[PDB]
Amino acid sequence: SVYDAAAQLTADVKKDLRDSWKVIGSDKKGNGVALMTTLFADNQETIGYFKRLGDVSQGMANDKLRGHSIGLMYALQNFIDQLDNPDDLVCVVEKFAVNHITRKISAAEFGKINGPIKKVLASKNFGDKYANAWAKLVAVVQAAL
């Protein structure tokens, strides 16, 4: 269950998540747009799902993409702040899961975000250990998809 996935996040994993978020989460506009643009560059097949945002190749200049990207970073902020209470983490994860279930986004497709996250982390010198920690958090969401 989603609870099982959340309940399994260990102290060391939460530590790595918080330490890396202190940095990547400090510039939500910049890193949020970077995450989205990287997803579009490496997984062009996903561009079609974001038609509401218009021309995503416009990057930072695209106000709709900018607003969406900042919002995405606050969903992550939410997750990070709820790490110590699985009950709360689960209810927020299920909420955002619905936002994607309605768009027909499968657990496998949601996992495509791992590549971009790994790259953004690396740009700030956070290695594989950190990317693995984030993959575990993403897996919590996948448990609800």
Per-residue x/- track, 9-48, ligand HEM (CB under 6 A): -------------------------------------x--
100 assigned to a ligand binding site: yes
- Site for ligand HEM (CB under 6 A): which residue of 22, 71, 84, 132? 71
Per-residue x/- track, 109-128, ligand HEM (CB under 6 A): xx-xx---------------
Residue type, 55: D
Question: What 3 state SS string does the chain have?
Answer: CHHHHHHCCCHHHHHHHHHHHHHHCCCHHHHHHHHHHHHHHHCHHHHHHHHHHCCHHHHHHCHHHHHHHHHHHHHHHHHHHCCCCHHHHHHHHHHHHHHHHCCCCCHHHHHHHHHHHHHHHHHCCCCHHHHHHHHHHHHHHHCCC
Is 80 a binding residue for a copy of itself by CB under 8 A? The answer is no
Stretch that binds a copy of itself, among 35-43, 59-67, 112-120, 130-138 (CB under 8 A): 59-67
The residues of the shown chain that bind ligand HEM, judged by CB under 6 A, are 46, 49-50, 52, 68, 71-72, 75-76, 96, 99-100, 103, 105, 109-110, 112-113, 138
Instruction: List, as residue ranges, the binding site for heme b.
Output: 100
